[PDB]
Each structure stands twice: as C-alpha cells, then as structure tokens.
Write a protein that binds this ligand. Structure first.
Ligand SMILES: OC[C@H]1O[C@H](O[C@H]2[C@H](O)[C@@H](O)[C@@H](O)O[C@@H]2CO)[C@H](O)[C@@H](O)[C@@H]1O
Ligand SMILES: OC[C@H]1O[C@H](O[C@H]2[C@H](O)[C@@H](O)[C@@H](O)O[C@@H]2CO)[C@H](O)[C@@H](O)[C@@H]1O
Ligand SMILES: OC[C@H]1O[C@H](O[C@H]2[C@H](O)[C@@H](O)[C@@H](O)O[C@@H]2CO)[C@H](O)[C@@H](O)[C@@H]1O
Length: 357
C-alpha cells in the first residue's frame, strides 16, 4: 500500500456539503488517504468555529447548557462515515504543536504553565492529553456504530502535528514524550498504526547536511527533534516528514533541490531503520517565482522511484460557504497552498500521479 494523499484541516467543523465536497474530490482525484485534525482545544477556539471537542479539561464535546453548537465528534463521525463510503483512508492527528485550534499552548494555559514545551513535561498536562485521546479513540461513531478504535477507515493515529521542543535541543524530551504517548495509544488501540506527525527534523547526523547550506536549523537539531531516534521507538510504526522550503529559509532557486535532498535523506534513513516513511505534508507557495507543478512532479517522482510509501500535498479543499467562499465559490486559498479538483496543472499532476502510486 503506497499512495498519493492530501491534508484537510476543517473536516471536524464544516458542513455536510463542504465535507462531501472534499472527500468526493479526493475520490475523483484518486487521492487514497486524507490527513485531518481530530482536535479542537480551548473554549475560545471552540466558540470561534461554534464546534466543541475539548473546550476545558475533562470536558469532551459540547459543554452542558451550551445549545445550538456543533459537536466536533459528530462532525468527525460524519467525515469518517463518508470516507468509509467513498473508500478514502484517514490519518487523524491528536494535538497541534501550533496555536491554531488551541494546540499545546492551550493545554499549557489550562494548567498554568509558562512555556509551550511544558506540554511535554507537566504530568497534569500529559494526563489531560491521555484523557482526551482515550475519549476520542473510544468514541462510538453515530453514523456507523463502530468505535474509532475498531474503524478500518482510520489508517493511523498521529500524536502531534509538527511537534517541536526548542527548550531541549538534545532531543531527549520528545523521545521520552513520544515513547510514553505512542505506548499509551497502543494500549488503548491494538489495531491501528501510530506515527508522530512531526516535520522530520534531524539533529546533526554525520553525512547529512542541507542542500546549498540553507535551512541548516532543519538538519542540526534546533527544533529539539531527533527524527532518527523517534523513528526507532518500538511503538511508532512509520516515519512522517513535512516539506516547506519557502517557510524554512530556502531560496526559491533552491526549493526543488533542497526538497529533493530532504526527501532522499528521509527515505534513506527510514529504509535503514526498516519502517515505512510518508512525506505527509509538502507545499510551495502559488506565488513562488518557480514552476510549482514541476517542483511537485520532481518530489513525487522521487518519493515514487526511491520506494517511499506515500506523498501527501498540503492541501486539498472543496466548495466553500458563508464567510469562507472565494471568487469561484471554493473554500479560499488562505495560505497559497490550496489545490482543488479543477483544471490547474497541479490538479492535473495529482490525478496523473494518483494513477502511478
Ligand atoms: O435520509 C437519508 C440521508 O439523508 C442525508 O444524507 C445525505 C448525505 O449526507 C450526502 O452525503 C449524500 O449521501 O446524500 C444524502 C441524501 O440522500 C443525511 O445526512 C443522512 O443522515 C440520511 O441518512
Ligand atoms: O505560528 C502559528 C503558525 O504556525 C504554523 O506554521 C508553521 C509551519 O507549518 C512550518 O512550516 C514552520 O516553519 O513555520 C510556522 C511556525 O513558525 C501553522 O501551520 C500556521 O497556520 C500558523 O500561522
Ligand atoms: O488553521 C490553519 C489555517 O488557519 C488560518 O486560516 C483561517 C482563516 O484565516 C479564517 O478566515 C477562518 O475562516 O478559518 C481559517 C482556519 O481557522 C490561516 O489564515 C491559514 O493560512 C491556515 O492555513
């Protein structure tokens, strides 16, 4: 099982019409796997989308006596049931490194900590993460009757989107947290694959340097991530990395080769450890002074030729509504990375590659 996949973050709070549009586009495009958020942390973030998953510690779903709100579990239920019908598999990520939808900083605010990375260290925070995740994994989907623990449409759980720990550049804080949490999940759910969901940063490995001396911090452990050590954890089933040369300090004329070397390095490392590896997010901004489709063709060829297990672009959207609808009626391209099922050369390329993988 090798695949072309994609990402979509609003599958747990948007309407049936918009959810169906993404998943029908993924099917029509040949996209076999969609990576989605399974979190919505903090009262303000839940209120902002009028959708509740984890507004306060120990409150899962909609607070008692909040009426007329969406329950993010029922939205995720609908998405899971529609993906099951349409034959799409799902990777569901359990917390965000970043503050969108609350993230680790929302947990730190609930428990009165003083740094983002207190998330990995404070036992009261870790306890609350475990409670949330246990609630989610045991949740019974209202459309299928099958608990998530038992639902084959779900391909994998991911611990944390783009996790970083800048306060411990030895890498040890994250190794310990990932061992703890991946084992915990295996304990709740013996059926599903577990991955980290991080960007794939290295921590000064002999023989691995960045292309063109740019974005060195991604190779030298600045973020506190030691990907190789994380992939060696017995309770992690496959490696994940992401790729955004434009965000990371790479010059445009080097996007394609920096990404090529990043991909080669990660597949080589994962092959030697002996686990599957997914390039699970990549994107080039639509305004970059380079040919984006040709960069995407290059990266997908590489993952295909080197035996990588999947390549997932950030991100796929469908039809929009309300205050999220652009000049063509789609969910807007807010970040410059959106791809939709249209006649763009990027959408054509995805359709072409989805036939190869
Ligand atoms: O009563 C049948 C059915 O109606 C609605 O289902 C929609 C579905 O949400 C769409 O994705 C598509 O499959 O067409 C259906 C309408 O024919 C409700 O959402 C559903 O609860 C209900 O069973
Ligand atoms: O700070 C919130 C900001 O962070 C995230 O963007 C990351 C990005 O995913 C990485 O590629 C990284 O190098 O830069 C950013 C953080 O500095 C969210 O993805 C984004 O929506 C959000 O604005
Ligand atoms: O969540 C990642 C996503 O968040 C932000 O997008 C907002 C958008 O700006 C709003 O107008 C609103 O309707 O919802 C979106 C998600 O909360 C960043 O603007 C966007 O770049 C990013 O991908």
């Amino acid at each position: 099982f090798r695949f072309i996949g994609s990402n979509n973050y609003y599958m747990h709070y948007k309407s049936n019409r918009m959810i169906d549009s993404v998943l029908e586009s993924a099917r029509d495009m040949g996209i076999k796997v969609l990576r989605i958020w399974g979190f919505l942390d903090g009262e303000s973030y839940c209120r902002d989308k009028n959708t509740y998953m984890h507004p306060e510690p120990g409150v899962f779903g909609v607070p008692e006596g909040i009426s007329n709100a969406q329950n993010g579990f029922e939205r995720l239920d609908y998405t899971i049931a529609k993906a099951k019908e349409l034959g799409i598999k799902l990777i569901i990520v359990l917390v965000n490194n970043w503050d969108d939808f609350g993230g680790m900083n929302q947990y730190v605010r609930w428990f009165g900590g003083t740094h983002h990375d207190d998330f990995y260290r404070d036992e009261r925070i870790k306890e609350e993460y475990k409670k949330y995740v246990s609630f989610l994994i045991n949740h019974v989907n209202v459309y299928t009757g099958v608990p998530y623990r038992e639902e084959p449409t779900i391909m994998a759980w991911e611990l944390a989107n783009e996790l970083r720990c800048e306060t411990d550049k030895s890498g040890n804080t994250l190794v310990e947290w990932v061992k703890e949490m991946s084992s915990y999940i295996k304990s709740l759910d013996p059926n599903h694959l577990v991955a980290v969901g991080d960007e794939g940063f290295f921590s000064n490995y002999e023989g691995f340097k960045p292309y063109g001396g740019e974005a060195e911090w991604a190779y030298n452990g600045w973020s506190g991530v030691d990907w190789k050590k994380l992939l060696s954890i017995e309770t992690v089933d496959f490696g994940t990395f992401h790729l955004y040369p434009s965000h990371w300090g790479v010059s445009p004329e080097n996007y394609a080769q920096w990404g090529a070397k990043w991909i080669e390095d990660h597949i080589k490392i994962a092959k030697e450890i002996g686990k599957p590896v997914v390039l699970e997010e990549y994107g080039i901004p639509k305004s970059a002074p380079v040919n984006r489709t040709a960069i995407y063709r290059l990266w997908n060829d590489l993952v295909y030729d080197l035996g990588g297990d999947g390549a997932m672009f950030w991100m796929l959207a469908g039809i929009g509504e309300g205050s999220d609808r652009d000049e063509r009626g789609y969910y807007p391209d807010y970040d410059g990375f959106r791809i939709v099922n249209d006649d763009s050369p990027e959408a054509e390329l995805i359709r072409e590659y989805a036939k190869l993988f």
